[PDB]
Amino acid sequence: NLPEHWTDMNHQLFCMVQLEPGQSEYNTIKDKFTRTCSSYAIEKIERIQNAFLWQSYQVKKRQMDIKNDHKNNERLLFHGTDADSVPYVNQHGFNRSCNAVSYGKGTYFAVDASYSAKDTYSKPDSNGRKHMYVVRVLTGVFTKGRAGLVTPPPKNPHNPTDLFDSVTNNTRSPKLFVVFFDNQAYPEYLITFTA
Amino acid sequence: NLPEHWTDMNHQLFCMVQLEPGQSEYNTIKDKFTRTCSSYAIEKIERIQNAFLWQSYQVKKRQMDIKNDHKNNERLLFHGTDADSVPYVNQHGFNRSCAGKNAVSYGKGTYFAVDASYSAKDTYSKPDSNGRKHMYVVRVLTGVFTKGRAGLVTPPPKNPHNPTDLFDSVTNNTRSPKLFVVFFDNQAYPEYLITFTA
Numbered sequence: 001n002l003p004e005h006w007t008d009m010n011h012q013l014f015c016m017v018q019l020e021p022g023q024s025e026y027n028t029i030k031d032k033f034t035r036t037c038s039s040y041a042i043e044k045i046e047r048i049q050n051a052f053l054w055q056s057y058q059v060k061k062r063q064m065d066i067k068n069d070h071k072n073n074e075r076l077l078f079h080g081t082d083a084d085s086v087p088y089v090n091q092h093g094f095n096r097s098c099n100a101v102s103y104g105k106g107t108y109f110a111v112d113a114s115y116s117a118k119d120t121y122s123k124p125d126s127n128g129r130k131h132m133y134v135v136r137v138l139t140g141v142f143t144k145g146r147a148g149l150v151t152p153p154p155k156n157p158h159n160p161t162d163l164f165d166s167v168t169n170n171t172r173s174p175k176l177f178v179v180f181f182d183n184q185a186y187p188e189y190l191i192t193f194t195a
Numbered sequence: 196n197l198p199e200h201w202t203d204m205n206h207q208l209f210c211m212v213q214l215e216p217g218q219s220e221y222n223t224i225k226d227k228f229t230r231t232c233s234s235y236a237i238e239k240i241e242r243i244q245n246a247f248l249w250q251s252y253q254v255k256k257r258q259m260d261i262k263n264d265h266k267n268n269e270r271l272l273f274h275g276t277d278a279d280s281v282p283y284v285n286q287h288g289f290n291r292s293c294a295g296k297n298a299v300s301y302g303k304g305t306y307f308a309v310d311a312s313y314s315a316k317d318t319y320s321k322p323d324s325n326g327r328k329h330m331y332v333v334r335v336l337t338g339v340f341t342k343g344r345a346g347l348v349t350p351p352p353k354n355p356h357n358p359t360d361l362f363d364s365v366t367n368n369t370r371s372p373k374l375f376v377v378f379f380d381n382q383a384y385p386e387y388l389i390t391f392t393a
């Protein structure tokens with residue numbers, strides 16, 4: 001069930017599709033970035049078409065929609081990456097096993113592109129190019145994180161296996177989310193940009 | 196897509212089904228165990244019916260069956276663990292972030308044994324306060340594998356010049372595999388829980 005807005009892949013399961021500047025999809029993703037990163041230069045935006053990652057992600061979304069009995073489990077977040085990690089992420093998504101993990105040992109995602117645009121996260125390559133993903137994240141029901149978590153905390157210490165879906169720095173006004181499982185995050189767009 | 200021989204779960208997502216000695220399902224697991232663990236006695240064998248773990252595992256299996264072409268990608272392996280881990284594994288499966296360092300490390304992942312005797316070591320199937328040991332029988336997507344090494348946080352590339360095209364798992368020895376390490380969520384389905392004693 002590959003999304004409508006995807007383009008034909010000639011029976012292949014993986015493609016990076018450069019977006020056309022000035023068309024709807026490009027303008028949408030550009031505005032989300034320029035909200036907080038209007039001083040950077042965008043070189044290009046690519047749609048990640050990974051059928052395996054998409055399928056595993058959609059299975060987790062349908063499971064979380066059943067478990068939570070509601071369907072607002074998804075958010076659009078940012079993830080800065082060094083050039084050398086881009087091929088891995090395009091292919092295999094985000095891997096907690098691969099900076100400071102103050103809110104737990106998972107994969108980190110920023111509400112604001114400004115945060116992901118830090119050189120510690122979006123490390124400039126030899127040519128000055130920085131890389132940031134726009135990511136669909138199953139944040140689901142969340143609580144405040146803490147150092148050393150390997151999974152989100154229990155929703156009630158009387159059932160230690162019924163878990164929050166993610167953790168955050170701040171539950172009232174979140175600026176980051178940590179997920180602790182593979183296939184809880186779909187890398188949807190890659191932005192290549194410069195300072 | 197839940198298997199047709201599972202007990203009806205009443206729209207429930209999870210349950211453990213106690214098996215009857217004399218049924219083929221119980222007897223084949225007992226034979227597989229006793230092949231190398233003839234000194235121990237089985238208390239019970241439970242079929243694990245976890246709808247969500249099953250779906251995610253079956254999606255990974257279909258993807259590996261597509262990627263590899265006519266490989267036997269699945270092996271039935273053993274995993275001994277402490278009583279404290281059993282409720283988490285039953286609900287959530289095998290989390291590499293929680294895995295022990297193995298005495299011979301072929302990578303930082305979850306370890307599965309070919310031989311029940313290996314999983315039956317007190318270091319893995321730690322006796323609980325009542326002297327009960329716990330061992331899972333696990334469908335593992337071993338796929339295409341190579342000899343691992345202690346540094347690995349994922350299986351290594353098949354080809355150094357193509358770093359993202361990975362082996363599916365690693366082993367101690369490709370000639371005589373006795374253990375497999377997996378590095379991803381939903382690559383192992385816990386199918387049965389063996390409770391046993393001395």
Ligand SMILES: COc1ccc(OC)c2c1sc1nnc(N)n12
Nearest residue numbers: 078079080099108109110116121
């Ligand atoms: C404290 O927050 C983080 C810790 C670690 C991070 O990745 C190493 C990270 C954040 S926010 C963010 N956006 N993009 C990335 N990679 N990250």
